[model samples]
Target: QTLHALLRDIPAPDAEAMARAQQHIDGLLKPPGSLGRLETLAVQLAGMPGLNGTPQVGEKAVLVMCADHGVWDEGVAVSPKIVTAIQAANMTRGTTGVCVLAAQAGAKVHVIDVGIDAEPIPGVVNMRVARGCGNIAVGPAMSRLQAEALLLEVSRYTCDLAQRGVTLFGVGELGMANTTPAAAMVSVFTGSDAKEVVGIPPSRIDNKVDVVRRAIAINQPNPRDGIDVLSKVGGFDLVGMTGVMLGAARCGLPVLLDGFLSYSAALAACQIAPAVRPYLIPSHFSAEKGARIALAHLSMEPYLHMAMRLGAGSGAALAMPIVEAACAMFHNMGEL
Candidate 1:
């Protein structure tokens, strides 16, 4: 499950199935392109597994990677780091934003603790890379090998889903100060200023310039490699979700991206493997300052402009039914 193997094993989406679906959808009884993206998504889902060929939306699987950030120690994020672990457990209690919405969407949420700074709780999956990452403001968030290890485990988890009948895949995160690392990752890959990708939380002003300047000034992350950048400043949940995207693409599951962090992970996956872009489905456009910029980097258009920035699989929960509704026309309707 090395990064190279994960990338190498991922075959591109089945084009012939997609072409067939397009032809079928185009000639359907509905108005021409009347379904718009609804039909388009059905066609894409149809082509995914080469399974039913008729396009089944399948079960909704939302993977929420939870972690704590060392950068939270630097006062980069508005909330305290303990919020990450608390919400990680809260989702299991059916009280977190993602959990409430996911229950309504008929989706299952699996929370994995990739680097949470707390003991194992009642329902959180323990997959800690460390209690938390090192403060990127002073040094690398993690070693290069540590980053690779995290990537491998995340990949394994996604791949394991095939055995469980997982059809729809979505990714989200609960991590304090994650936005900063996401912006740093985006800044390195796009060669844009870090300040440009960093979003200002409403609770605070745009101190992103100071945060990015201070971290990059000290860590000196290697811009030449995305993994290097991840190793230096990326949060575990960010990089781990990148692994999910890579593994999901390999397994032919369509991934609904939650918000800015998921978008940033999709960008990194594309950098590592160009073919993964087609498998990513943009769920919604967040109000986070960099959500648009990050999605633009991936050249994706979100389906809903909900102005949501809840960041805990909320967008994915909302978008699941949209995909299901898209599949319904193809599954339940007929040509006129």
Candidate 2:
């Protein structure tokens, strides 16, 4: 069934069961609210299954969707589109930071090229939505139909993972200059000043000033609105990641956000579907200007704060083990 169909079909949790689950968790080993954000996370999982205990890890899947954003044409990012493939190469080689950490965590990493401009890398799952998105700062990034089709593609891939017993899911993106769009989205969603939103410079590149300047020039923050910002600068990968989060929520899978870009997409997803908020867990807070703002708007407190700026799903992969530990503590040891 399609994502929409599946989402509509999934039954909502019984109110009585949800209340009992919350009380059961409150009586666990840890002090009330001592688990911090994780307490809420545990409650969300309980509500999903209508159970009074922690959900089983069952299976784990990390799906990294790689795509090239045409925003590169505007000089908002230092790297060219080709770097996407280069990173994908490293990921497929199992040498990327996230790949290594995910392997260590005992989770399988699946890399999918949803819309990279380069030729397909052999052995990588190819689910190209388009060659790349049009530079939306100058025009429409994608048609409504393309957006719907991309969401369906995400659902199809997610269903495949779900069938394999993947109950825990995380979404990450591999695209350069994605933070430009993310900043725009943040400025709009929170009504924060654009200058404030562009507080920090790009961590990986030298032309940080130029990147921020171009983002301001193209996006032009007129009134600072989220939908306008996303339409102006968002990429297909961003939209695709948004769909992945929604898909995970519909399937009752806990979806974790990776970095600035991934959190930006999650923010956009929550904006579109507010129910998605309960299923999301922020993995870390990046050094990006808008990362904290996005997390704050979502009312999410991340588990780690390592000042990481790497965006290839590395942060989320590192946090996977911690989440597993939390689950194991509750499930096996009966610890809170």
Candidate 3:
């Protein structure tokens, strides 16, 4: 993939840019580091090439990638698989959680349907990588060639979004049984087992265990090979979010990851390209069990913890104003 080609030239945000931002941060009116991570964010945001000019979030894109999981039959999720299409369509109708929050935060919600069983949702980016994945419990979720091809296109969308005045990226997704693959991916990368990584509710499940075990047993995903793991157990939108994070790093834009699935995607991305880690910003501490574990594995501390389990970029939307406030403080307020 082009990611391999792009890896050599891509490094984390420039140190020079970060140092300059830090200097400005120290010079602000408040005591040194009093603002805590806010200062860290300003410094990091400044390191992005375009952000150095100003802290104003001239634009932000809350990217919601939608897909259907073939693993739903395993009862890995409580939400119905068809909800993926409904909400993808509803997201654009200004009636979904992400859309409402994105509007309130003055961010644009861009929904994309990478894979689904239903027709394309109006106003959603209809790349339609496939109707949906094959059930991983029985076999590979997708082919290696298909995974690579989709990643390339997903990266294409990320680059395009960056080119069109979208500075920061908020990653989210819709797919029932999504967390199963996400958890499976996390298990492979973090060296955690399915029992520990799985996040389905305690008693809310009808389709049950060794669900993760069975999926891995059937697919035998290779942790060493990210594309293999992606093809083995990942949903299209989950992998698509991974591509978005990678492309965001390439574009030098900050990416705020949403919930459990988003964190898992970020983990898969970092596993493939550790350099992209610097460009990612953890948005919220999700209620999902794997979210905390995943965040810890990434060595990140999520900024918000409002018991948010909604996985449609809603948390990312809520985090935007807080992000703007940090930048605004640096842009306006001063030190003695």
TM-score per model over all chains: 0.94, 0.85, 0.94
Per-residue lDDT tens digits for candidate 1, residues 1-336, read 457877787876787888888887766787665788887788878777624465776567889998888888777776877888888888888888888788888889989889999887777878899998988878888998988888888878886886688778889998888888888777777777766777765434456557776777787777666677788878798888888887788787788899988887887788777878877889999887778778777888899888888567889888999988987887677865
Ranking of models by TM-score: 1, 3, 2
Give every collision pair in model 1.
29-336
The number of clashing residue pairs in each candidate reads 1, 0, 3
- Tens digits of per-residue lDDT, candidate 3, 1-336, equal 665676554556767877877778777778655788888888778877646544557688888888887778766666777888888878878898888889998889888888987877778888787888888889988888888777778777886776678888798998767777888888877888677777754554324447777877788888877778888988798888988887788777788999988988888888778888888888889998777688888999989988988658999888998789888888788666
Worst 10 residues of 1 by lDDT: 200-209
Q: Model 2: runs farther than 4 Å from truth? A: 1-17, 26-38, 50-54, 199-232, 334-336
Candidates 2 and 3 compared: the better one by lDDT is: 3
Give each model's whole-structure lDDT: 0.81, 0.70, 0.80
Return model 1's CA RMSD, one decimal: 2.0
Residue 212's lDDT within candidate 3 is: 70
Task: Tell me how candidate 3 scores on lDDT.
Answer: 0.80
Question: What is the Cα-based TM-score of model 1?
Answer: 0.94
Give the Cα error of residue 226 in candidate 1, in Å. 2.3
